[PDB]
Amino acid sequence: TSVKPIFSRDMNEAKRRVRELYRAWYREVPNTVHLFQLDISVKQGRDKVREMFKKNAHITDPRVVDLLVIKGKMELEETIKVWKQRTHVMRFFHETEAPRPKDFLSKFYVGHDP
């Protein structure tokens, strides 16, 4: 059970990297909306950042956390340097997705998928 670390030697070290990334993402949203001329609000973008961080709050492997932070940092670099286009930034909001009901009955009516 002794494995080579990526960056953080334990969860406490990893969590500090998470918060450093979150601050960078939090600070960058106003520029992203300004630079990409997005119609969303700065609040909507910051809520989306929170939502992306919240979906990974159950991880307890410092290595898995380090990879998530690594991918988050790369994700931020593309946005800041405007390598992403508006289409790439707005893919987080799934604006053209018709909502898929999550209850048994609604699924039962529409098809066989569970």
């Binding site: 048994f104 009955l105 039962f108 066989h112 569970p114």
Partner: protein, 134 residues
């Protein structure tokens, strides 16, 4: 009429004459608006207000385990005991045997080919029946 799924169209549990539990696998999906059979009844229960407590295939199989635990031991033949007791109880009520000779429903091959809704609807079985009779 509530259209359901055939055995080729669902992952269903069947127990053979040994008491061995086995499960099918979905090979194709049901046609038209037809649905998985246990899902129709679960959907009905919710509409009726008496919602059943399982929403997935695994959960309803956990329910099978509570009623008869061997229904989820797939490909395993679980032995059954207590023939002595089943025989003691069978002698309590005496009953007469009929004078009818024991005659199975299927005497010859023509009686074999159609015995359920699926084989009755089958044109290949109908060809087989026509062949053996003629």
């Amino acid at each position: 009429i509530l259209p359901g799924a055939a055995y080729t169209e669902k992952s269903a549990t069947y127990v053979n004459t040994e008491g061995r539990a086995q499960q099918t696998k979905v090979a194709v999906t049901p046609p038209g608006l037809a649905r998985e059979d246990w899902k129709i009844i679960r959907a009905l229960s919710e509409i009726a207000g008496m919602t059943l407590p399982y929403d997935t295939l695994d959960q309803v199989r956990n329910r099978l385990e509570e009623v008869s635990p061997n229904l989820v031991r797939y490909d395993d033949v679980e032995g059954a005991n207590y023939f002595q007791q089943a025989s003691e109880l069978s002698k309590l009520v005496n009953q007469q045997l009929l004078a009818d000779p024991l005659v199975p429903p299927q005497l010859t091959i023509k009686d074999f080919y159609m015995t359920d809704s699926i084989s009755r609807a089958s044109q290949t079985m109908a060809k087989c029946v026509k062949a053996v009779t003629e």
